[PDB]
Ligand binder design. Structure first.
Ligand SMILES: [Ca+2]
Length: 161
């Protein structure tokens, strides 16, 4: 257990939006629990909840990341992805993005999204590594309402391997 967020304290902590979307810790909705992190007012597929995790981790290591997701409005099914945003040498114009996992969710049902990931070594100059959830990429002109549904995440966990 290197990092855990279950939201049961009601705290947003260091979670943040990627763009103009809205994050809220809600009560009465959670994965086998009363609280979770809702992302709404999404207007791009890449809007979604993000948190910096590099400080929790040993550079060079392999770790297992998992989280639970759920959505409860719009289409009968929808894909959610779990991804990493990486920064090197504090260069914010050349961020890297890598999807680590994706699953099809059924409306109203919690599902686990997980994978092993690699934490780059110190000598790479890695300066940020953030996990985030999103829907599959579409260019801004092609985005539809089903792509920008609000969704919940909960029980975010990173474990040693
Ligand atoms: Ca919870």
């Amino acid at each position: 257990a290197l990092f855990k967020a279950d939201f049961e304290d009601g705290n947003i902590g260091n979670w943040r939006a990627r763009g103009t979307e809205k994050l809220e810790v809600v009560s009465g909705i959670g994965h086998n629990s009363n609280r979770s992190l809702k992302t709404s007012s999404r207007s791009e597929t890449y809007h979604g909840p993000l948190v910096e995790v590099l400080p929790y981790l040993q550079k060079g290591s392999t770790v297992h990341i998992s989280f639970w997701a759920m959505y409860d409005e719009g289409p009968a099914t929808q894909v959610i992805n779990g991804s990493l945003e990486k920064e090197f040498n504090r260069d914010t114009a050349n961020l890297e993005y890598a999807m680590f996992a994706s699953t099809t969710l059924n409306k109203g049902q919690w599902k686990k999204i997980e994978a092993d990931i690699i934490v780059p070594a110190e000598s790479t100059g890695i300066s940020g590594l953030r996990m985030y959830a999103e829907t599959p990429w579409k260019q801004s002109s092609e985005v539809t309402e089903t792509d920008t549904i609000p969704f919940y995440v909960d029980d975010v966990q990173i474990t040693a391997t």
